[PDB]
Amino acid sequence: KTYQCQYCEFRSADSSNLKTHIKTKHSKEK
Ligand SMILES: [Zn+2]
């Protein structure tokens, strides 16, 4: 299988680029 994002519809078959995704796209610096 693949992985999914729990914010948007970002389902990638990578972890290194899914966790970074979450950080740089949902939980950045606020
Ligand atoms: Zn996302």
Curated annotation (Swiss-Prot):
<comment type="function">
    <text>Probable transcriptional activator. Binds to the consensus sequence 5'-AGGCCY-3'.</text>
</comment>
<comment type="similarity">
    <text>Belongs to the krueppel C2H2-type zinc-finger protein family. ZFX/ZFY subfamily.</text>
</comment>
<protein>
    <recommendedName>
        <fullName>Zinc finger Y-chromosomal protein</fullName>
    </recommendedName>
</protein>
<feature type="zinc finger region" description="C2H2-type 6">
    <location>
        <begin position="3"/>
        <end position="26"/>
    </location>
</feature>
